[PDB]
Amino acid sequence: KGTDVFKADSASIAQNYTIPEWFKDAKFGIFIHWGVYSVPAYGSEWYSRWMYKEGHPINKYHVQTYGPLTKFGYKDFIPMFKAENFNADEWLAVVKSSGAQYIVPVAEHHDGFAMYSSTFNKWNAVDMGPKRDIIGELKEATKKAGLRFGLSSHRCENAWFYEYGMETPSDVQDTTITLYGERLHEPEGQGMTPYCGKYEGSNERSRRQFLMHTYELIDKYQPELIWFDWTVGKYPFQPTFYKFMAYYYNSALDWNKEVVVNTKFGYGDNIQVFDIERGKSDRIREYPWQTDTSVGKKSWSYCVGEENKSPDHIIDDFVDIVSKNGNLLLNIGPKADGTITDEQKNVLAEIGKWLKTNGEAIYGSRPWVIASEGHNAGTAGYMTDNTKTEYTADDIRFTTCDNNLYAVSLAWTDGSVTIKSLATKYCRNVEIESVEMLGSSEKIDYKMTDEGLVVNFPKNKPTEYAHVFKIKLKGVVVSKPLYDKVDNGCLITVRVANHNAEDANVTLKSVVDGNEVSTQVAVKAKSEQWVKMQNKDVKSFDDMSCKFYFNDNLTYENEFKK
């Protein structure tokens, strides 16, 4: 078509790409790991890699259960992947009942098997296994369901996923079998780092095939979101990935659709949507991001003996995620025959029921001045979210929408909470106009005090898990300051919300070690903004004396040591 607004570099993409509003408004999507690995249903979806590692538990399990590596390899699961009870409409009904707004089936995982109608990859679900275009059928059901269709690609790791099959007698050593990839060594680098060391993680043919892979996905299914696994960020792969990004963003312009890319590291927060695997953020992040996590604690694909999270665990993390500008991409793992388990069906249905009542606080919302208050901050970071926090009613998460304030208690109480973030020191002319709990017909009795807004819970729980107060208020509110260390100084970050219908001007003052920095800020009516300040010539960050002022009212001082 010739559309070439986007060139294959980060400056070009940053000049013209904007994370779309639909992703910020959507908040919630369903991930679905399903493939050949679902047949053995043992360990996890990494079965293909570990079965060829002689001595590994999965290897020893496979030899006894299915046979030696030379007689029964991973490819030999494919005839057993018949998917006799797969029905795209049934999957979409479950996703829709969860309240999710977009769906991300796995188009191809690490194992080499394309779950779509591929041209270059003969190991695909149209010619083999299910003998149907799983991705295509899901795309169709998604459109009828009225949701947005995405998909994930994990093919970058296929270059090295089968490396151990070269080090022991196996069918992987037959290099004419393209399913098993380039058989390279795993790239070096611990965790979410672009460093690859002595093993690049890809080669010329795998990069060429990656582009063939993404191009046909783009061209055939026009997904509104493409999610990529961690290795696309390794340094030797980045030129190839930027080629993909420009082609996707250019194609999207032709579609009159705005699209989303997910990576876990290696690319700027502003040119794609940052994603954290099995973990969330501890702070409000400037740019929209995504937690992708599984209902199963052990695995993404179905495996016998999976320990599924509770709805309370997931919904508490969900609210925490949304309060910090994040989306939740929640994974289910259906049985090999195409059946979503009843436990994971129940988890999604419970979330959907909660969202039916409390969705006004979630859909279309944005972070407030501060995401959370209370004693229990919760988990944060890569591979931390299997731990469940024991929240109280005092653990509160905030969102905002249409100038309304939503304060979500992560547990119940027969008494009252006090919203400390509305304490008088953070406020200027804050007047509470109304308080209600979503889904409750009981008039909420509340009282503004110097320590914050005291709110008494109603008699009856509208829902379990989490409970939402909708607050209409005027006035200006500032967050407590966040201090970050830099060279010879410190960075101060607050957020200010003007809930008034009139424009407001606001003065913030940071006094650090005698150095006084001030900024006057014009905040339009019914708006909020970041305010970053810097105190320089600070000789010791650990020994700082700090005072912060909101229009000459003391908001914070670090009166206590270290």
Ligand X SMILES: OC[C@@H]1O[C@@H](O)[C@@H](O)[C@H](O)[C@@H]1O
Shortest separation between residue 445's beta carbon and Ca ion, angstroms: 23
Q: According to the annotation, is 312 in a ligand binding site?
A: yes
Q: Which of 465, 474, 444 is nearest to 456 (CA)?
A: 444
In this complex, which beta carbon is closest to Ca ion, that of residue 200 or of residue 350? Answer: 350
Which of 224, 277, 316, 528 is in the footprint of ligand X by CB under 6 A? 277
Interface residue with ligand X among 66, 274, 300, 469 (CB under 6 A) is: 300
Residue with tokens 């052990």: 298
Residue 411 to residue 406: CA distance in whole angstroms: 15
**Is residue 73 within 8 Å of 66, Cβ to Cβ?**
no
Close Cβ partners of 239 (under 8 Å, ≥ 6 residues apart): 8
Residues 322 and 139: their CA atoms lie apart, in Å, by 26
Question: Total residues contacting ligand X (rule CB under 6 A)?
Answer: 6
Q: Which is nearer to ligand X, 104 or 478 (CB)?
A: 104
**Least distance (Å) between residue 307 CB and Ca ion:** 19
| Token couple for 559 | 């009166």
Q: Is 81 a residue that touches ligand X (CB under 6 A)?
A: no
How many of the chain's residues bind Ca ion (CB under 5 A)?
Answer: 5
Which residues ranging from 23 to 42 are in contact with Ca ion (CB under 5 A)?
none
Least gap, CB of 147 to Ca ion (angstroms) = 27
What the block records as the tokens of 130 is 């299910």
Q: Which is nearer to ligand X, 137 or 292 (CB)?
A: 292
Q: How far is CA 59 from CA 68, 163, 415, in A?
A: 9, 14, 56
DSSP code for 296: B
- The token duo for 223 is 């997904």
3 state DSSP class of 135: helix
DSSP states of 172-220 as a string?
GG-TT-GGGTT-PPPP--SSS-S--TT--S--HHHHHHHHHHHHHHHHH
> Minimum distance from CB of 33 to ligand X (Å)?
6
Least distance in Å: CB of 25 to Ca ion? 24
- Is 328 among the annotated ligand-binding positions? no
Per CB under 6 A, the list member of 292, 306, 317, 394 interacting with ligand X is 292
Find the shortest distance in angstroms from Cβ 153 to ligand X.
11
CB 405, min distance to Ca ion, A? 20
Residue 410's binding partner out of ligand X, Ca ion, none, with CB under 5 to 8 Å set by partner kind: Ca ion
Q: How far apart are CA 530 and CA 512, in angstroms?
A: 20
Q: Is 45 one of the binding residues for ligand X (CB under 6 A)? A: yes
Among 216, 224, 229, 316, binds ligand X (CB under 6 A): 229
Q: What is the rounded distance in angstroms from the CA atom of residue 39 to the CA atom of residue 77?
A: 7
Q: Which does 317 bind (CB under 5 to 8 A by kind): ligand X, Ca ion, none?
A: none
Q: Flag whether 395 is marked binding.
A: no
- 159/512 with CB nearer ligand X: 159
Asked if 312 touches Ca ion (CB under 5 A), the answer is yes
292 binds, among ligand X, Ca ion, none (CB under 5 to 8 A by kind): ligand X
Sequence-ordered list of residues with C-beta below 8 angstroms from that of 561, at least 6 positions apart, any chain: none
- Maximum Cα interatomic distance, the chain, rounded to a whole number of Å: 78
Given ligand X, Ca ion, none, residue 549, with its beta carbon under 5 to 8 Å by kind, binds: none
Alpha-carbon distances, residue 247 vs 2, 5, 92, 171, 251 (angstroms) = 11, 10, 29, 36, 6
> What does 316 interact with, of Ca ion, ligand X, none (CB < 5 to 8 A by kind)?
Ca ion
Considering only residues 166 to 205 of the shown chain, the ones binding Ca ion according to CB under 5 A are: none
- Judge whether 316 and 323 are in contact, CB under 8 Å: no
Q: Are 501 and 525 in contact (CB under 8 A)?
A: yes
Residue from 316, 360, 385, 394 that binds Ca ion (CB under 5 A)?
A: 316
CB of 382 closer than 8 Å to CB of 350: no
Using CB under 5 A as the binding rule, the residues of this chain from 428 to 467 that contact Ca ion are 465
The DSSP secondary-structure symbol of 562 reads -
Q: Minimum distance from CB of 463 to Ca ion (Å)?
A: 10
Q: Rounded to 5 degrees, what are φ and ψ at 338?
A: 100, 10
143 vs 388: CA distance, rounded Å: 35
Nearest residue (CB) to ligand X, 333 versus 378: 333
Q: How far apart are CA 10 and CA 268, in angstroms?
A: 8
**Min separation Cβ 279 and ligand X, Å:** 10
Closer Cβ to Ca ion, 105 or 374, answer by number: 374
Q: What length does the chain have?
A: 562
- Regarding 163 and contact with ligand X (CB under 6 A), the answer is no
Please tell me whether residue 410 binds Ca ion under the rule CB under 5 A.
Answer: yes
Residue 499 binding result from Ca ion, ligand X, none, given CB thresholds of 5 to 8 Å by partner type: none
Told to check if 306 binds ligand X by CB under 6 A, we report no
Q: Does 216 bind ligand X (CB under 6 A)?
A: no
**Residue 316 or 385 with smaller CB distance to Ca ion:** 316
Residue 232 near residue 263 (C-beta atoms within 8 A): yes
- Residues lying near Ca ion in the complex (CB under 5 A) are found at 312, 316, 410-411, 465
**Residue ranges of the binding site for Ca(2+):** 312, 316, 410, 465
Instruction: Please report, as ranges, the residues that interact with ligand X according to CB under 6 A.
Output: 45, 154, 229, 277, 292, 300
